[PDB]
């Protein structure tokens, strides 16, 4: 009982991303609460996301995204093909985060998608170490040479040797050999994991896809990679969405698989057609080695009910509904 999105232009991963964001129910409810009463529909990306989500909720007919593409200004043909799926997510989520500022749902975007990370550079020779902390909304994981997501996280937190021609400048201590590393402090309730499915060559300016077999589990234990573990909230995550690209280059066939209720009931979202699908077609058939996954969405098991909370028609403000209904009448 889920409606799809019209193909329209070459939106690439956008339709796959929109369904993923739409079925993050906690995000959707906060999006409806955004005060777009005074926003002009031309350049209002927060309002356009409300229109897309509202149609995805109350339309049997396929849902259009023409106004949304105009909202964040990706109207040229190559705009999506010159960009990335995580870059599009930032544009949408940053705009709604600013909109929610000063409201009851302020901080919803950082609460759901933001985690805490530590990056360190410890000089081996002298007693020097820097311990910068950086927040992240998404994680890009390496699939080349890695068999499963566990090895990608192992390589992610693996130490890098800053020796030879790439030593670390310690200033007063001087140029010395050091190790560079990254550790995870916190993991967000909604975990966006993008896979490095393409390798780029600066010399020849060519993009080569990595269709090698990369495994992702239905349930993902990540307590090991945390710097400090926490009892009563282990870092165990459940697979929610699998964004898949079947082509051999940028542009092609972008399709996303979801189990919106977290029940394991998987459906295939291919633009206009939303067909029920097998768990087999969702997880393992997209391991690769044409179709293979480029992005994965995991939800922490503790936050499963809250993130995927039931959304009713009463949740959408009547003002917004009437404003959207009025525009449909004028058409």
């Amino acid at each position: 009982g889920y409606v799809g999105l019209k193909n329209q232009g070459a939106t690439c991963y956008m339709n796959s991303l929109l369904q993923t964001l739409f079925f993050t129910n906690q995000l959707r409810k906060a999006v409806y609460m955004m005060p777009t009463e005074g926003d002009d529909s031309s350049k209002s990306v927060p309002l356009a996301l409300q229109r897309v989500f509202y149609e995805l909720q109350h339309s049997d007919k396929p849902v259009g995204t023409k106004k949304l593409t105009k909202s964040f200004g990706w109207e040229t043909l190559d705009s999506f093909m010159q960009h990335d799926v995580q870059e599009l997510c930032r544009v949408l989520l940053d705009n709604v985060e600013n909109k929610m500022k000063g409201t009851c749902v302020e901080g919803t975007i950082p609460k759901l998608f933001r985690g805490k990370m530590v990056s360190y550079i410890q000089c081996k020779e002298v007693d020097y170490r820097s311990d910068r902390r950086e927040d992240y909304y998404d994680i890009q994981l390496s699939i080349k040479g890695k068999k499963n997501i566990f090895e990608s996280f192992v390589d992610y937190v693996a130490v890098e040797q800053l020796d030879g021609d790439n030593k670390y400048d310690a200033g007063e201590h001087g140029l010395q050999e050091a190790e560079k590393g990254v550790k995870f402090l916190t993991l967000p309730p909604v975990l966006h994991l993008q896979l490095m499915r393409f390798m780029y060559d600066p010399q020849t300016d060519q993009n080569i896809k990595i269709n090698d077999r990369f495994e992702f589990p239905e349930q993902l234990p990540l307590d090991e990679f945390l710097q400090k573990t926490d009892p009563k909230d282990p870092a165990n995550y459940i697979l929610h969405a699998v964004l898949v690209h079947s082509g051999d280059n940028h542009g092609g066939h972008y399709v996303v698989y979801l189990n919106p209720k977290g029940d394991g009931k998987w459906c295939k979202f291919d633009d206009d057609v939303v067909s029920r699908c097998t768990k087999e077609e969702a997880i393992e058939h997209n391991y690769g080695g044409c179709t293979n996954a480029y992005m994965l969405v995991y939800i922490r098991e503790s936050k499963l009910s809250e993130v995927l909370q039931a959304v009713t028609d009463h949740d959408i403000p009547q003002q917004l509904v009437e404003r959207l209904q009025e525009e449909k009448r004028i058409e």
């Binding site: 393409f198 940028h250 992005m295």
Partner: peptide, 14 residues
């Protein structure tokens, strides 16, 4: 974007 010893992308553009 750069990582380890090479440049990569998801969906394939750089």
């Amino acid at each position: 974007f750069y990582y380890r010893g090479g440049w990569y992308s998801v969906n394939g553009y750089c």
